[PDB]
Structure 1
Amino acid sequence: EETFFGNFDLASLSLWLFYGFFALLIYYLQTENMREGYPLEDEDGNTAANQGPFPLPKEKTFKLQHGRGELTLPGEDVQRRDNLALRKTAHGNGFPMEPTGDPMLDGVGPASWSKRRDVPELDAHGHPKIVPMSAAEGFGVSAGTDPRGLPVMAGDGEIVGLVSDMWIDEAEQLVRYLELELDPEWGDGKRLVQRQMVRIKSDRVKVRSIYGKHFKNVPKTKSPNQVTLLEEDKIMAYYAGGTLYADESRLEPQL
């Protein structure tokens, strides 16, 4: 086989064509991932002077189900929090912020939640997706240890109440939440725990993230039969913030 010029043959032409195509593909891939969080801002909420080397993408529209409307991106930030109890620790950019009051109650840091829609997520038939087991026709524990009726122990070693029910996702057949009834000494009413934050044993159920005295301030659902996305985010973030804010020794260097 011959060359076009010098040492240039068909393999070289193919290689350079792939180089050009890959450069265009990298541009497309990086531009496609900029539909959330832009334009950039500084630490005072103003638009930043630098916006980077890539321009922003054009708009796409999503047609949602069950008559929820349309979504156009990139657009305005509708999940933005309004009044955050935070304080700057420096005059410029690049330094951390300090909570003004109680970080766990104010939803800041690892306890932060995003302002999602105030409606439950639906399944294919238009029904709420997560339902307590006491109202779910045909479901039963088929494997593992059933946690209903067991006491719950906090991270500091206190018994705070008993498991009363389980909330399940019927479409995917999975347990999502555990429902806890509190003793009068540790609060009143019922609270929820996400399944990924518990360890179920033979005689107890352990939640290590928070202590007993923190169990009365867990956010509460409005209806006893359904939970919206906003409540889900606030409940999950509350438990997640305890990994750092439960004790002062969890925040300081471990060395």
Structure 2
Amino acid sequence: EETFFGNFDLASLSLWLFYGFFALLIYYLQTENMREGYPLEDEDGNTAANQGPFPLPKEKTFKLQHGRGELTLPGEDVQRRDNLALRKTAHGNGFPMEPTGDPMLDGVGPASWSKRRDVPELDAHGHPKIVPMSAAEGFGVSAGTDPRGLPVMAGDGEIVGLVSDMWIDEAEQLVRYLELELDPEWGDGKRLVQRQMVRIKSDRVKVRSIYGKHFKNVPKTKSPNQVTLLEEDKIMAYYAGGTLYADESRLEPQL
């Protein structure tokens, strides 16, 4: 085989062509990932002077099922929160924020939730996706330990009530939530706990994220037979906020 000029042959041509293609592909991949969260803002809520070297992409349209309309991105932020109880700890940018009231009750920090749609998620048939186990026909426990009837222990060793039901995902045959009936001392009504934050034992179910006194302020569902995306977000994040805000020692340095 011969060379076109100097040491340049077919392999070098292929290598340079691949270099060009890879550069274009990297540009495309980076630009495709800027459809959420832009343009950038400063710490006062205003548009920043610097926006980066990659310009914004063009628009694309999603056609959603069940007649819920269309979604076009990039666009305005419809999940934006309105009034946040936060305070700046400095006059410039690059410094943390300070909660104004109760961070667990105000939904800030690790307890933050997003403003999702106030409608339940639907399966292929158009039914609510997550349903209590007492309304699902033909479903039963096949393995593991049944948590129904067991007492619930909080993060500080307090028993707050019993597990009364489970909320399952009928389409995927997976358990999503555990329902809890509270003792009159610790509150009233029923509360939901996501399955990812519980440890089922032979005689008890333990929730280490929050303490006993934090159980009465868990967000409640409006309907007893379904839950919406907004409620799931608020319930699930309230439970996540306790890993930091349930005690003063969880926030200060461990050393």
Q: 1 CA distance for matches of 2:83 and 2:186?
A: 30
SS across alignment from 2:239: helix
- Tell me the percent identity: 100
Runs of 5+ consecutive residues of structure 2 not aligned to the other structure: none
1:41 Cα offset (Å): 0.0
Runs of 5+ consecutive residues of structure 1 not aligned to the other structure: none
Residues 65-112 of structure 1, C-alpha deviations (whole Å, 9 max, x = no match): 000000000000000000000000000000000000000000000000
Matched, 1:216 2:216: yes
> TM-score, normalized by length of structure 1?
1.00
Within a 5 Å distance, the mapping from 1:183-202 to structure 2 comes to: 183-202=183-202
Residues 96-153 of structure 1, C-alpha deviations (whole Å, 9 max, x = no match): 0000000000000000000000000000000000000000010000000000000000
Within a 5 Å distance, the mapping from 1:70-149 to structure 2 comes to: 70-149=70-149
1:219 Cα offset (Å): 0.1
1:229 Cα offset (Å): 0.1
Q: 1 CA distance for matches of 2:63 and 2:109?
A: 33
1:45 Cα offset (Å): 0.2
Q: 2 CA distance for matches of 1:162 and 1:218?
A: 16
Residues 177-204 of structure 1, C-alpha deviations (whole Å, 9 max, x = no match): 0000000000000000000000000000
Q: 1 CA distance for matches of 2:44 and 2:136?
A: 49
Q: 1 CA distance for matches of 2:131 and 2:212?
A: 27
SS across alignment from 2:242: helix
The Cα RMSD (Å) is: 0.2
Query: Which runs of structure 1 show a deviation greater than 3 angstroms over 4 or more consecutive aligned residues?
Result: none
SS across alignment from 1:161: strand
Q: 2 CA distance for matches of 1:185 and 1:253?
A: 34
SS across alignment from 1:56: coil
Q: 1 CA distance for matches of 2:246 and 2:74?
A: 38
> TM-score, normalized by length of structure 2?
1.00
Q: 2 CA distance for matches of 1:162 and 1:82?
A: 37
Indicate the structure with greater helix content: 1
Aligned residues: 255
What is the match of residue 58 of structure 2?
A: 58
Q: 2 CA distance for matches of 1:146 and 1:71?
A: 42
Residues 201-241 of structure 1, C-alpha deviations (whole Å, 9 max, x = no match): 00000000000000000000000000000000000000000
SS across alignment from 1:162: strand
Q: 2 CA distance for matches of 1:162 and 1:106?
A: 28
Q: 1 CA distance for matches of 2:143 and 2:50?
A: 55
